[PDB]
Amino acid sequence: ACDYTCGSNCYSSSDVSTAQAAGYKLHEDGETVGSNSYPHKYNNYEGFDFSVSSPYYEWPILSSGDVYSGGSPGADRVVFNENNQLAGVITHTGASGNNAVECT
Ligand SMILES: Nc1nc2c(ncn2[C@@H]2O[C@H](CO)[C@@H](O)[C@H]2OP(=O)(O)O)c(=O)[nH]1
Ligand SMILES: [Ca+2]
């Protein structure tokens, strides 16, 4: 079973932790990757009830299991905060335009 399911993509807690560590590492170094500059602030326009405090940052999580290193970020994102706490896993899949929904 998936710990997080973003559309058709299935993620385990281990996939999420691995992606989160990568994103957070770049964040503490003031570094960014990809044409879209990841990680970057996640504004929470959707107003998800993250139990973890802001500010929030998003980083891509890939269905291939690889850690994001530039190139196509796909539609899935791990969201974490300043304390390296997981806020949630979200996706653009199944959401109109640039909106996002949570992975269930
Ligand atoms: N849907 C959504 N996108 C956000 C938010 N904060 C940052 N973004 C990013 O801003 C872009 C334009 O709104 C989005 O496509 C998304 O980038 P990602 O593609 O990196 O997820 C947010 O709170 N909601
Ligand atoms: Ca996996």
Biggest sheet character: 5 strands, antiparallel
Strand content: 25-35%
Contiguous helical run count: 1
* Widest beta sheet: strand line-up: 3-4-5-6-7
Give the number of domains: 1
CA-CA gap between termini: 12 Å
Rg, alpha carbons:
12 Å
CATH evolutionary superfamily: Microbial ribonucleases
Query: Any ligands, ions or cofactors bound here, and which?
Result: guanosine-2'-monophosphate, calcium ion
Structure commentary:
With 104 residues, this protein is an alpha+beta fold. The chain has a single domain, classed as Nuclear Transport Factor 2, Chain: A. It is 16% helix and 27% strand. The chain has one helix and seven strands. It has one helix at 13-29, and strands spanning 4-6, 9-11, 40-42, 56-60, 76-81, 86-91, 101-102. Strands 3-4-5-6-7 form a five-stranded antiparallel sheet, with helices on one face. The protein is globular, with a radius of gyration of 12 Å. Bound molecules: guanosine-2'-monophosphate (2GP) and calcium ion. The active site is at 40, 58 (proton acceptor), 92 (proton donor). Its EC number is 4.6.1.24. It is an enzyme of class 4 (lyase).
